[PDB]
Design a protein around this ligand. Structure first.
Ligand SMILES: CSc1ccccc1NC(=O)N1CC[C@H](C(N)=O)C1
Ligand SMILES: [Zn+2]
Length: 139
């Protein structure tokens, strides 16, 4: 689990959104596994606006942050799970690193701020849903 809190927005994995996130929906895209809902309080996360390919991610199944190299956002085939059938997920970045299903939501950050959140993984990989192209999170 986990979210990004920027301005009056809450960014979560769409598969982990609550009934309240849907009532307060701003934008969602199943093909990206993202959902953004509105908040009453102002958030303090800064979103990165960059092309960094190295950063640090939080892994809740190890209670540890790991430095990683990751691929640029792209269309990647993601195996079936209890939340989606097998499909291509867009804006996805992959890295070699530990991840378990409950690690979705962990932040990936670079020197510029938040890059994205854990969204896919397995077999020694970890995938992150990019948020750096969502310029409107800033206004
Ligand atoms: C860190 S996710 C993970 C880790 C180990 C094994 C499997 C996984 N995958 C998942 O449980 N999911 C749930 C839906 C998510 C998606 N974006 O399609 C993929
Ligand atoms: Zn950066």
């Amino acid at each position: 689990s986990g979210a990004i809190y920027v301005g009056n927005y809450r960014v979560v994995n769409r598969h982990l959104a609550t009934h309240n996130d849907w009532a307060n929906l701003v934008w969602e895209d199943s093909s990206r596994d993202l959902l953004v809902s509105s908040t009453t309080a102002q958030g303090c996360d800064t979103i990165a606006r960059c092309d960094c390919q190295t950063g640090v991610y939080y892994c809740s199944s190890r209670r540890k942050h790991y430095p990683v190299s990751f691929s640029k956002p792209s269309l990647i085939f993601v195996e079936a799970s209890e939340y989606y059938p097998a499909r291509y997920q867009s804006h996805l970045m992959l890295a070699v690193g530990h991840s378990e299903p409950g690690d979705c939501g962990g932040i990936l950050r670079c020197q510029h701020g938040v890059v994205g959140i854990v969204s896919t993984g397995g077999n020694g990989l970890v995938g992150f849903a990019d948020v750096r192209d969502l310029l409107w999170l800033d206004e």
